[PDB]
Ligand binder design. Sequence first.
Ligand SMILES: Cc1cc2nc3c(=O)[nH]c(=O)nc-3n(C[C@H](O)[C@H](O)[C@H](O)COP(=O)(O)OP(=O)(O)OC[C@H]3O[C@@H](n4cnc5c(N)ncnc54)[C@H](O)[C@@H]3O)c2cc1C
Ligand SMILES: Cc1cc2nc3c(=O)[nH]c(=O)nc-3n(C[C@H](O)[C@H](O)[C@H](O)COP(=O)(O)OP(=O)(O)OC[C@H]3O[C@@H](n4cnc5c(N)ncnc54)[C@H](O)[C@@H]3O)c2cc1C
Ligand SMILES: COc1ccc(C)cc1NC(=O)Nn1cnnc1
Ligand SMILES: COc1ccc(C)cc1NC(=O)Nn1cnnc1
Ligand SMILES: COc1ccc(C)cc1NC(=O)Nn1cnnc1
Ligand SMILES: COc1ccc(C)cc1NC(=O)Nn1cnnc1
Lengths: 588, 588
Amino acid sequence: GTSQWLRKTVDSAAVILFSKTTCPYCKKVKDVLAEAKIKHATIELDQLSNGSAIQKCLASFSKIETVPQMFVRGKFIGDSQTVLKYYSNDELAGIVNESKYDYDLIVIGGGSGGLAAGKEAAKYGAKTAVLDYVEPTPIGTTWGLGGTCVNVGCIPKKLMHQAGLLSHALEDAEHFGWSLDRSKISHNWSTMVEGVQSHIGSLNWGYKVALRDNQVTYLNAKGRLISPHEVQITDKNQKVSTITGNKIILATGERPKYPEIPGAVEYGITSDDLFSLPYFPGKTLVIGASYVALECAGFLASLGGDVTVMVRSILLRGFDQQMAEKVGDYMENHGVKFAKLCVPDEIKQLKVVDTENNKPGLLLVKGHYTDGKKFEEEFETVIFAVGREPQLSKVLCETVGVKLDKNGRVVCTDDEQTTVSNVYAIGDINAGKPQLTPVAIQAGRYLARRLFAGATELTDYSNVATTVFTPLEYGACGLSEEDAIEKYGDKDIEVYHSNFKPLEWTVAHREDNVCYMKLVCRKSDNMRVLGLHVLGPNAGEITQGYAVAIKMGATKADFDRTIGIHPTCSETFTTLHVTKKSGVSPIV
Amino acid sequence: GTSQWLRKTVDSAAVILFSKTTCPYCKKVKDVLAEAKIKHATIELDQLSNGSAIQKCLASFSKIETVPQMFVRGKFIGDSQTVLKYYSNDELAGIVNESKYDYDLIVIGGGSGGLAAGKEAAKYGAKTAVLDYVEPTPIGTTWGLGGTCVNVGCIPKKLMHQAGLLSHALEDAEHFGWSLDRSKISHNWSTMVEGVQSHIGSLNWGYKVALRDNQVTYLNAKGRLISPHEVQITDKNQKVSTITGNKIILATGERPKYPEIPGAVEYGITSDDLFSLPYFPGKTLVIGASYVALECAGFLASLGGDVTVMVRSILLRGFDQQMAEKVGDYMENHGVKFAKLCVPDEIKQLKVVDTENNKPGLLLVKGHYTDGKKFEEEFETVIFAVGREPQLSKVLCETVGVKLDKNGRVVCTDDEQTTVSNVYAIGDINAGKPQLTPVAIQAGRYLARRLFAGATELTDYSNVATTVFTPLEYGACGLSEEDAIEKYGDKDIEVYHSNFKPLEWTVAHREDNVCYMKLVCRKSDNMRVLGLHVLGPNAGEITQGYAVAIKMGATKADFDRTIGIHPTCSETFTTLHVTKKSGVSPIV
Ligand SMILES: Cc1cc2nc3c(=O)[nH]c(=O)nc-3n(C[C@H](O)[C@H](O)[C@H](O)COP(=O)(O)OP(=O)(O)OC[C@H]3O[C@@H](n4cnc5c(N)ncnc54)[C@H](O)[C@@H]3O)c2cc1C
Ligand SMILES: Cc1cc2nc3c(=O)[nH]c(=O)nc-3n(C[C@H](O)[C@H](O)[C@H](O)COP(=O)(O)OP(=O)(O)OC[C@H]3O[C@@H](n4cnc5c(N)ncnc54)[C@H](O)[C@@H]3O)c2cc1C
Ligand SMILES: COc1ccc(C)cc1NC(=O)Nn1cnnc1
Ligand SMILES: COc1ccc(C)cc1NC(=O)Nn1cnnc1
Ligand SMILES: COc1ccc(C)cc1NC(=O)Nn1cnnc1
Ligand SMILES: COc1ccc(C)cc1NC(=O)Nn1cnnc1
């Protein structure tokens, strides 16, 4: 019990001190380590339930039961007297740096999870390297350190979402008494892109500064695991070399897919290219129906574009389908066109992109509908958003022994361990886990603490809240209504729901019964809230706080006994009463 | 136990049917009652755990133990055979309208609480009257049905707040690429007031329709309780008369105070006047420091006004003072002037209000600072926001026996009962309760269910969340930091905090380290969250969901194990780690 925890902690920590807050011999050792700039983890035995048990188990490694005790990479180094002996004889630095490996930790992948993992490990004295390389897109787009979210994901996409939201603010401002005329204002794509890219560039630089100031080695190099402890690296001159590490974290992410049709790679683009595109896309076709597809179509339309979405089957597969249909209905009423039950067959080039005068090309898209009829129409830009995939064959040699699943993602235990004992996987490549930036960050930081500080806390992957940043935003936490009915049966599910209107929409003359919210509850478990859903402005700010209550097992009675804040959209959750079974209208 | 509940329920229900869902004799009685439009409460004995005890206890009133049993105003009417007999002999209508009083319920006050109470009572067959009268302000301002929030409170002030926020949206729009020029755009006060007042008028009308459609009698008349069951009414022609009711609910709210100085009533205004003023206030002095004072000064400055606030002692007395000071610092950085440690001595008229040309007048304000130096300055408008108070001497004869406290509010039990057993009080006049619209609504609806449908649930007044809608908003739930320390001692309190920057503020070049959040926790109670505080955009949307978790007893561990939604401001609560004791900086 306590015995096996201690063994695992000692064998894995790079530099760890067992201590008590009251002992001045411990403070004497802490001070010496700080002066020599030796980072390390510390376990305060007087602050743990069974510290007396641990203190006695230390004797199995050190043959002493007293405190302080200092270990380096699994080896007992000395008590107080012995540590100062090493310091006074100029022997300490060599002892704390001796290792079987170049690094205590190598992180392959410099994104959300990998940077979090690497920075947290370095805090406890682990010698860490972070590798990052951005393979260019087919048209050659590349970008800096920080991963998909920072450079070509959550960050630029929400900033262009905000640019779109501000067109409605301009319209609203007239009704609230401001003297502008929305009809005579236009948008400049390249001005927006310049401001977005300047912020992304501040994040690239911030991550390099953060790694330097944590003593993490950053190599802008492509890494490949060739044996459990050996990583082959290739630099910007295709210089190939090999570095070794005790623990390995795979954190390499995914990239967009293309459909296997003529012209797709040659003449279309993905979200990877959209966020630094030097010209306005113009008349645009978006192929696919994921949250990426709908978010991009949405702000392009709000910035004045002529936008079409080609849907093969349904919107937002895997999300609550009543909510997904409301999302699409709103964007169709505000100008996005939808080609339903439709897939593409080929893309033909009619004009090459005018890279001089900063203008898109021109393309002819041919496709067909699910019953047989034909699609044919011209667009200036075609954006594919038909999913994302890893390519671990680039990253990982099959002889190493790391098990993948049928989709190509890494099969892991609940502490992120692979089938190779010293290798771990986090973020989007970890099979079966929600593919989200805060998840990757929590997994990376918690894992680093278990490896190098003796921590025990695991990452909880259940009921993680989401928000889709469509022109009207959709926040959710927990089960969709159809998944709850499937799992428990229709007779055991009760659904409370209501329309609402934001107070901000009244004077602005916006729609009465379009925003909408519901709670999906289990009758036989005290009306436990299984899933929460809201369509409305600021949906992510609305949903976040409820994710804590749902984590704690909130029931409908908990929502009822809590008082609303007025006037807000969120307060409508505190007074829901119309059930779906009753048949009463949810309108207001 | 069961027997004391049953007698309380039978005595005060207006019309109540005891029933079982599986009984066709009960369905036959329900059907007759519906056809005759007889509204009534219903208790389904088969859906209660001690329904068997209640069934046998009914015999104490009816000498029978079967269902259905129908009662009217405390008297057993009959079983199935007897009710149908009364029906087909045309005697039922007269039976159910038999009463010792004109009304089962009289509500004095047509605001947030009183309207909620009256509509809910009428659903269970209580014959109900709602009285509402709006005493004009000193300059003559009056308004329609709905109370302070609807007409001169939450609704118009948040609409005017939104007009102020749109100022910054117009500014932010240029940085995100829109072609407008903020500096050439101005605001028209009367156009804003016209749109606000048109929405308020639709609320006035909607409440009158709601009372008509619930068969509630609405009397636009001033009420006075002269004995436990008699209410004297005075109509708009000064006709005086008396009506009687079984139960009385007092729900008359408060009105603004004026300081006792020369010129205040004659030449200044209050929030009651501000939301329908026909001219822009111009250069304005706000006297006071409540949330009313700061919210009003705030939107006035954003709409282009030259605004000063004169503060007796501190801002937002009774709220967390670190957050109060940050609220003030932001207002002052964006234009609002503050006259600290200062009070007014007299207001002098230099120009009368120009009601022809639609212009304010001009005033000379004289005052002094606490060290004795003098204040003297000219303003076009002076707004007093120096507190609110009930005036129950106009509502309630002293001989009735209703106890008041030192501030003139009604002393109530935790079920809203006064010292007169048939008389209840709800909303702002209920001593010691938070003075908020959703509290008054919850109190009123829960009380009507207990009086007329046999409910037992009480209103929970603890840990009610708030939001102050200053230009940068402040949301809170639970204890201030200084209150937590007073109650538990400094060593049992830990404070986690951080600055943050909304993503929307990056491209717009807004401030880096102004938004702020903290969690105030109790060490010896598993780091229980005692209070949550946040300064930033959409602070009410952010705070609301967390109020469910605090109601449930959330700890710091519950916040840590919940995952963030990215990118949002609210997610910063899920990763807090810097403590105040550590002395580490909270900047990002
Ligand atoms: C358009 C879009 C919008 C999104 N919006 C959101 C949102 O609003 N909220 C949210 O939570 N999530 C969002 N996501 C998802 C989020 O971006 C991912 O979940 C997250 O980036 C995954 O982090 P990661 O560490 O697993 O991988 P990544 O962040 O992709 O980082 C992996 C890194 O490793 C590099 N790499 C790959 N192979 C190698 C190699 N052999 N050697 C070295 N380096 C290598 C990659 O180039 C990359 O830099 C969005 C995604 C997309 C595509
Ligand atoms: C400027 C301002 C802003 C506010 N903003 C917010 C906010 O954002 N959120 C929030 O939760 N709360 C807010 N409040 C508080 C909220 O308005 C009150 O808590 C709420 O209105 C109290 O409701 P009530 O039912 O107790 O009384 P009221 O709503 O005041 O209703 C009482 C009614 O009874 C009438 N009446 C009085 N005497 C008699 C009589 N003798 N006979 C007949 N009728 C009579 C009154 O004229 C009035 O119509 C604000 C208040 C103010 C002043
Ligand atoms: C693929 O589904 C859509 C695609 C585009 C859009 C615009 C909407 C939908 N949703 C949808 O069908 N809406 N709806 C109409 N009547 N019932 C539901
Ligand atoms: C006619 O207005 C009323 C409406 C309803 C009622 C019950 C009374 C009045 N009496 C009235 O004139 N109010 N008043 C006071 N100071 N100026 C005007
Ligand atoms: C009455 O207090 C204020 C009044 C007006 C304003 C504008 C601000 C405050 N707050 C305040 O004192 N801020 N501060 C400065 N250094 N420590 C705290
Ligand atoms: C965004 O700041 C402004 C810009 C322009 C102007 C003319 C005003 C503001 N001030 C602002 O936020 N409103 N306000 C009210 N009380 N303090 C501040």
